[PDB]
Design a protein around this ligand. Sequence first.
Ligand SMILES: NCCCN(CCNC(=O)NCc1ccccc1)C[C@H]1O[C@@H](n2cnc3c(N)ncnc32)[C@H](O)[C@@H]1O
Ligand SMILES: NCCCN(CCNC(=O)NCc1ccccc1)C[C@H]1O[C@@H](n2cnc3c(N)ncnc32)[C@H](O)[C@@H]1O
Ligand code: NA
Ligand code: NA
Lengths: 332, 332
Amino acid sequence: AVQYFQFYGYLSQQQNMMQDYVRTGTYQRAILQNHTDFKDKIVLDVGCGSGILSFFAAQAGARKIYAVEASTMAQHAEVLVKSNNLTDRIVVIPGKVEEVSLPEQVDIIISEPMGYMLFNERMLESYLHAKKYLKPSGNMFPTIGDVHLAPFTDEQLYMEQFTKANFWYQPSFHGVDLSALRGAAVDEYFRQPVVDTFDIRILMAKSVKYTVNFLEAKEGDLHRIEIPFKFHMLHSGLVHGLAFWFDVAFIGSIMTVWLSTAPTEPLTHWYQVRCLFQSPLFAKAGDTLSGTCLLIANKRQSYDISIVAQVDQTGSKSSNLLDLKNPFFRYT
Amino acid sequence: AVQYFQFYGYLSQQQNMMQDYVRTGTYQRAILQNHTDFKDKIVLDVGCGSGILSFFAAQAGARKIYAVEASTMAQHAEVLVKSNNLTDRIVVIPGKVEEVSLPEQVDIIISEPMGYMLFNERMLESYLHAKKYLKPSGNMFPTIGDVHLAPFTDEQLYMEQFTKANFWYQPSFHGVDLSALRGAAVDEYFRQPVVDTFDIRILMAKSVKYTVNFLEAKEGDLHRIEIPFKFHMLHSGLVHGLAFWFDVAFIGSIMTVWLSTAPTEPLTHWYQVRCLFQSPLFAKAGDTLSGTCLLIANKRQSYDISIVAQVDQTGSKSSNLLDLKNPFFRYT
Ligand SMILES: NCCCN(CCNC(=O)NCc1ccccc1)C[C@H]1O[C@@H](n2cnc3c(N)ncnc32)[C@H](O)[C@@H]1O
Ligand SMILES: NCCCN(CCNC(=O)NCc1ccccc1)C[C@H]1O[C@@H](n2cnc3c(N)ncnc32)[C@H](O)[C@@H]1O
Ligand code: NA
Ligand code: NA
């Protein structure tokens, strides 16, 4: 938790995030296209970072914005509030949203709590916790999250896991036989979710969607996420694993604005995530690939990912158990 | 500590380290050129990782090697011991060297406990702690460590710190004036030690040396390290900061073998480290640059670095306080 809050305390990290043009532009459009939803309202910005969303709320004419930030980035937000002449309208509160006092309830909660595969962020539970401050009528921005799963074919990604483990084949590394660890090295590589982008031509079926309604979801809902799937295969070939991405919708009174991390959309700093099966499955177009993706919260502000899949027409099955704490950042 | 031991638990990390050819080749030469110092002896390998140093001790004819490893890498070391037919001669002990039981005292301790700038590794104190197991006559490999400091001139590195902060000059970033944070952003960049290599032509004086004798040093000695310097300037120009590197010597009965991370030597995964002054100092050839580098252990298994320097002939002075927990990895 010291490491988590140290990470977010750096202006270099805020700069890196603010340079995702899709992320910045989409949040600004969501808030300002729905300006009637903010004008003269009370706003809570959960994990405000440098404060940009609180400035967007102010741009839309919000009367009072409580900007809550647990890292030392709170001191930098406070400098921008003063320098942009908004000490009347933005109140920066240093601390955890679970531990601070707000002097009143709010019309709307705004946040950017999304991790890789949507869920990989201790902030999303904190976002749902913040609803204790929301008036009964109140809204959340974002309002819903859709996680998308689709089967992919990519023998280059599959074969890379073996190639990276080739080091361990050496029978005389400075007189040591390393070969007994080659299997363990391959296994370790297979248990890392792969963060990068890819051509949509690797996707073999239309995605399945798991929707979280942030207006309705409770903190505890995110501890165990079970996503059944049945894919109608549109392509014939080896299925190497599942690809993951997410959309969030800001459901305003004037319009719904989408932030999509789909591989059909401009690239974001979320990229996409791929989880290999331990062994690939042959599917023909018209086959069904059925199974379950289970995300179980672990104590590392991350998730164990269990995937089981079978081709219904053959009974051929595979699985994997991955740790989203140790992702492989493959993007170059 | 969970993060530290998770990091070292990965075969991918052991592979990365084992592919530093200078590191592997130098440890093998040190041990095998001094084979008479290992033959029929009892050895302790502190933080053995995959076990390579224990295999090198075995190559030199050691009778019994206790290989102590606190991470899950201990299970992988045990697989190599079995597969290389050395269960008679190498005993893998899972746990911290501070907490485990050895059944006997040892002739020699071998380890690779060196971090950036030598000291940046919770293992070096653990290496000195291990001496509780060393026979009075006993040796340590490595035996001594030399940290080298030298003044450097590099206006490209200096100007980069301002260039990276340029983002924050924006008077209308999506309608927000970021400029009040530009100073803070520059300051943050200046407080990161820079890990990369450089041409020796940037060094303006012969290095000063701080020596740690691992045979004599106590655990507590490493909490506060004070390095006074007086440089005899050999070049005229702006001094932008201090450059750091280190050598360790394996002082065997047959020969002394050096592992050097100097910028005059083949590159290692330690590279070199540079700490900027907040403001550069003009020195002419023949001037003296005097001051102190103070390393104070912090609770992040790292060090605060305080540097003060003055050109004696002008009185012009500068300083910085850096955090070795947040280094900038600039090498490309
Ligand atoms: N992708 C996940 C990025 C998540 N960040 C959000 C950073 N906010 C941000 O960039 N806003 C501006 C923006 C600009 C453009 C578009 C969108 C937003 C998390 C932020 O919350 C902080 N935190 C975590 N847990 C808690 C807690 N319990 N209470 C209070 N603060 C907490 C944490 O220190 C950090 O500053
Ligand atoms: N540069 C710093 C790299 C430091 N590593 C050393 C890894 N050893 C290694 O590569 N040896 C093989 C080798 C090959 C070629 C040349 C040289 C060596 C630290 C290793 O000690 C482990 N650890 C840390 N603190 C403790 C402790 N208290 N007790 C026991 N184990 C502890 C930690 O998990 C990790 O496995
Ligand atoms: Na292919
Ligand atoms: Na120059």
